[PDB]
Amino acid sequence: EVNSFSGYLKLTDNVYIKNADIVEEAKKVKPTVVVNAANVYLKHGGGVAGALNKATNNAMQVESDDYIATNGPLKVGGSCVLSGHNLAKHCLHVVGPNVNKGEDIQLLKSAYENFNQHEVLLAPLLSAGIFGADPIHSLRVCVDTVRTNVYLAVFDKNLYDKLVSSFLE
């Protein structure tokens, strides 16, 4: 069926969260939109972006290279809509700031604002992992900024539990 999300915990009227791999969620749910945690040149070299690209058997990377050739790189805090391939109807490539590389944490609000152009999205926790943002802060920005229906997949039970505890304080 359409957007068949299961086993999520509803945090607010529009934010849900699950301990899950976003790739496995995209394969089972077939969401209208899957968010990729992209970089400005759409080079999906590892982490979340490498895993989504691998699940499309590199079709996502070829399409991203053609997009960059015609349009140039994205800006930090920006996004573009490309094909979802076998994972979704569309992939929304969003660039959150990479704090470990000196980018401004304030741009995380701009990054989440891109989600508001889509009614329902399956997404990762922006700027977390090796991008270096505090994951509790990233969830607070998501809850305060996103107004459409967002299903967050966080592939780590330890981090999932710390995020739910922090939200329910």
Strand order in the sheet with 33-37: 9-12, 15-18, 149-153, 120-123, 33-37, 90-94, 79-83
Cβ proximity to ligand A1ANW: between 33 and 51 the closer is 51
Identify the helix (H) or strand (E) that includes residue 161: helix 157-167
Query: Within positions 16 to 75, which residues make up the interface with ligand A1ANW, using CB under 6 A?
Result: 21-23, 37, 47-48, 51
Instruction: Report the candidate in 117, 133, 128, 130 with the shortest Cα–Cα distance to residue 154.
Output: 128
Residues 117-156 as x/- pattern, contact with ligand A1ANW by CB under 6 A: -------xx-xxxxx---x-----------------xxxx
Rounded (5°) CA angle 88-115-37: 65
Residues 82-121 as x/- pattern, contact with ligand A1ANW by CB under 6 A: ----------------------------------------
Residues that bind ligand A1ANW (CB under 6 A): 21-23, 37, 47-48, 51, 124-125, 127-131, 135, 153-156, 159
